[PDB]
């Protein structure tokens, strides 16, 4: 995180601001990574 | 002795070819590299690129000009 903070503070206004750092406007598709337990008996955690 | 004006014109035009030629080569190489790195600014740099060539061209033209001043 510290190295990434230094690198992001270094680069400003680049060509489409990198690739993974690109603030791509007109958002049309969002992918979600949800992490859940493999087994039950957790309580309200999986439901929450 | 023969006419030294021919030798003068030849030397002037040849050196005006040597100097601005290498200058233009370096300018074009640098501009091409910069365009290949950051294309999003290319117009700005290419404008500056032409400016540099202009000055080099002027120097070469200067030699040619004085070459004509020796030619006739």
UniProtKB/Swiss-Prot annotation, chain A:
Q: Which domain of life is it from?
A: Bacteria
Can you name the source organism?
Chloroflexus aurantiacus (strain ATCC 29366 / DSM 635 / J-10-fl)
Q: Would you identify the family this protein belongs to, as annotated? A: Belongs to the ATPase gamma chain family.
Tell me which stretches of the chain form a coiled coil: none
User: Briefly, what is this protein's role?
Assistant: Produces ATP from ADP in the presence of a proton gradient across the membrane. The gamma chain is believed to be important in regulating ATPase activity and the flow of protons through the CF(0) complex.
Q: Provide the assembly information.
A: F-type ATPases have 2 components, CF(1) - the catalytic core - and CF(0) - the membrane proton channel. CF(1) has five subunits: alpha(3), beta(3), gamma(1), delta(1), epsilon(1). CF(0) has three main subunits: a, b and c.
Subcellular location per UniProt equals:
Cell membrane
What is the name of this protein? ATP synthase gamma chain
From Swiss-Prot, chain B:
Recorded topology in the membrane: Multi-pass membrane protein
Q: Which CDD domains match?
A: ATP-synt_Fo_c
Entry keyword Cell membrane: yes
Q: Which InterPro entries match?
A: ATP_synth_csu_bac/chlpt, ATP_synth_F0_csu, ATP_synth_F0_csu_DDCD_BS, ATP_synth_F0_csu_sf, ATPase_proteolipid_c-like_dom, F/V-ATP_Csub_sf
One GO MF term on file is: proton-transporting ATP synthase activity, rotational mechanism
- What main location does UniProt list? membrane
Any single GO CC term annotated in Swiss-Prot or TrEMBL for this entry: proton-transporting ATP synthase complex
**Superkingdom of this protein's organism:** Bacteria
Q: Recite the UniProt keywords alphabetically.
A: ATP synthesis, Cell membrane, CF(0), Hydrogen ion transport, Ion transport, Lipid-binding, Membrane, Transmembrane, Transmembrane helix, Transport
Q: Which residues cross the membrane?
A: 7-27, 50-70
Compartments (UniProt record): Cell membrane
Site note Reversibly protonated during proton transport, residues: 57
- Stored PROSITE patterns: ATPASE_C (PS00605)
Self-association state and partner proteins as the record states: F-type ATPases have 2 components, F(1) - the catalytic core - and F(0) - the membrane proton channel. F(1) has five subunits: alpha(3), beta(3), gamma(1), delta(1), epsilon(1). F(0) has four main subunits: a(1), b(1), b'(1) and c(10-14). The alpha and beta chains form an alternating ring which encloses part of the gamma chain. F(1) is attached to F(0) by a central stalk formed by the gamma and epsilon chains, while a peripheral stalk is formed by the delta, b and b' chains.
Question: What is stated as this protein's family in its record?
Answer: Belongs to the ATPase C chain family.
Q: What does this protein do?
A: F(1)F(0) ATP synthase produces ATP from ADP in the presence of a proton or sodium gradient. F-type ATPases consist of two structural domains, F(1) containing the extramembraneous catalytic core and F(0) containing the membrane proton channel, linked together by a central stalk and a peripheral stalk. During catalysis, ATP synthesis in the catalytic domain of F(1) is coupled via a rotary mechanism of the central stalk subunits to proton translocation. Key component of the F(0) channel; it plays a direct role in translocation across the membrane. A homomeric c-ring of between 10-14 subunits forms the central stalk rotor element with the F(1) delta and epsilon subunits.
Q: What is this protein called?
A: ATP synthase subunit c
Annotated organism of origin: Chloroflexus aurantiacus (strain ATCC 29366 / DSM 635 / J-10-fl)
